[PDB]
Design an enzyme around this catalytic site. Structure first.
Site, PDB file in Angstrom:
ATOM      1  N   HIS A  92     -17.884  11.216   2.777  1.00 33.99           N
ATOM      2  CA  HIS A  92     -16.920  11.532   3.975  1.00 33.99           C
ATOM      3  C   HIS A  92     -15.591  12.385   3.359  1.00 33.99           C
ATOM      4  CE1 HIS A  92     -15.302   8.591   0.857  1.00 33.99           C
ATOM      5  NE2 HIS A  92     -14.230   9.064   1.034  1.00 33.99           N
ATOM      6  N   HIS A  94     -11.637  13.979   4.250  1.00 37.15           N
ATOM      7  CA  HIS A  94     -10.207  13.780   4.286  1.00 37.15           C
ATOM      8  C   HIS A  94      -9.742  14.774   4.825  1.00 37.15           C
ATOM      9  CE1 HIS A  94     -10.047   9.516   2.314  1.00 37.15           C
ATOM     10  NE2 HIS A  94     -10.799   9.960   1.498  1.00 37.15           N
ATOM     11  N   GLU A 104      -6.529  14.896  -0.880  1.00 36.96           N
ATOM     12  CA  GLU A 104      -5.708  13.807  -1.586  1.00 36.96           C
ATOM     13  C   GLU A 104      -5.241  14.370  -2.964  1.00 36.96           C
ATOM     14  OE1 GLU A 104      -8.662  10.459  -0.769  1.00 36.96           O
ATOM     15  OE2 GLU A 104      -6.923   9.975   0.603  1.00 36.96           O
ATOM     16  N   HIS A 117     -15.822  13.645  -0.636  1.00 35.64           N
ATOM     17  CA  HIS A 117     -15.818  12.576  -1.368  1.00 35.64           C
ATOM     18  C   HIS A 117     -17.455  12.171  -1.330  1.00 35.64           C
ATOM     19  CE1 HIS A 117     -11.385  11.254  -1.638  1.00 35.64           C
ATOM     20  NE2 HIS A 117     -11.600  12.382  -2.361  1.00 35.64           N
ATOM     21  N   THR A 196      -9.461   5.640  -2.512  1.00 37.88           N
ATOM     22  CA  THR A 196      -7.990   6.126  -2.102  1.00 37.88           C
ATOM     23  C   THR A 196      -7.892   5.559  -0.599  1.00 37.88           C
ATOM     24  OG1 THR A 196      -9.216   7.969  -0.696  1.00 37.88           O
ATOM     25  CG2 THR A 196      -8.436   8.185  -3.215  1.00 37.88           C
ATOM     26  N   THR A 197      -8.895   4.340  -0.305  1.00 36.97           N
ATOM     27  CA  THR A 197      -8.562   3.723   0.971  1.00 36.97           C
ATOM     28  C   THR A 197      -8.689   2.173   0.410  1.00 36.97           C
ATOM     29  OG1 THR A 197     -10.922   3.829   1.217  1.00 36.97           O
ATOM     30  CG2 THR A 197      -9.416   5.480   2.487  1.00 36.97           C
TER      31      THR A 197
END
Ligand SMILES: [Hg+2]
Ligand SMILES: [Zn+2]
Length: 258
Positions: A92, A94, A104, A117, A196-197
């Site tokens: 995915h 960002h 990020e 990622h 990161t989520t």
């Protein structure tokens, strides 16, 4: 109601529902190139994506994931700082609302337009769900995207976004080759961190590639047309779905090059 990237449900609020947001090995972090330790014992990265089998692409409300068949060692990652084989399950992105932000991880405080990622899980654990309960259960390959020339291999993804504009939508996405998104060099930085989520689990060995891949302005613009909201709800453009850098604390970033 739940987490997001808005003023009322963004990164600064996550600690309330996920206390680990303030943990000891949170990601992303700023990569200081002058303090990063060159480690000569780090092995070269081994990326075997030739037998990859993509299945579907979906808009989950916070980004869009391209899923892979991880029932066998078809697309795996090994070598580098890893012990064992890690299976690719999904990838995915960002990105930001403008070209000057979106990634990020940052390098010497520099922000890129986006960050890809590639998520893998340690096969020793049987399945992804068991992998997220181990300190070495996941390996995430991070790739920076800068705006410049078009990335041919990324066009098939860009073209399908129309069909998955809103939260919940999915589309068959077979025969996609991930190798088309890799930079020329595999030099990297590595450190122990987390997803990161939310749930922000600390099971990740991060491998961030030094060399960014370039994509066109038109390509990133397509990402910005996606929606956070579900169909029928007021439109909220999916932009700035990135988490700010976190304190390095008691961690050292290692470099495979000097
Ligand atoms: Hg973990
Ligand atoms: Zn991510």
């Amino acid at each position: 109601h739940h987490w997001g990237y808005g003023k009322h449900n963004g990164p600064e609020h996550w600690h309330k529902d996920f206390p680990i947001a303030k943990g000891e090995r949170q990601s992303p972090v700023d990569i200081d190139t002058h303090t990063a330790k060159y480690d000569p014992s780090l092995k070269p990265l081994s990326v075997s994506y030739d037998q990859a089998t993509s299945l579907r692409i979906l808009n989950n409300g916070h980004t869009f994931n391209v899923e892979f068949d991880d029932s066998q060692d078809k697309a795996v990652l090994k070598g580098g700082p890893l012990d064992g084989t890690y299976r690719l399950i999904q990838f995915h992105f960002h990105w930001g609302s403008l070209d000057g932000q979106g990634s990020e991880h940052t390098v010497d405080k520099k922000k890129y337009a986006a960050e890809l990622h590639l998520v893998h899980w340690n096969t020793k654990y049987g399945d992804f769900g068991k992998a997220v309960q181990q300190p070495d259960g996941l390996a995430v390959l991070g790739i920076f995207l800068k705006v410049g020339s078009a990335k041919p291999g990324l066009q098939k993804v860009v073209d399908v976004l129309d069909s998955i504009k809103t939260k919940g939508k999915s589309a068959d996405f077979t025969n996609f080759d991930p190798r088309g998104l890799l930079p020329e060099s595999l030099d990297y930085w590595t450190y122990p961190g987390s997803l990161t989520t939310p749930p922000l689990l600390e099971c990740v060995t991060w491998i961030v590639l030094k060399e960014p891949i370039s994509v066109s302005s038109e390509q990133v613009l397509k990402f910005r047309k996606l929606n956070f909201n579900g169909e029928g709800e007021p439109e909220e453009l999916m932009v700035d779905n990135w988490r700010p850098a976190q304190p390095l604390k008691n961690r050292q970033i290692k470099a495979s090059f000097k």
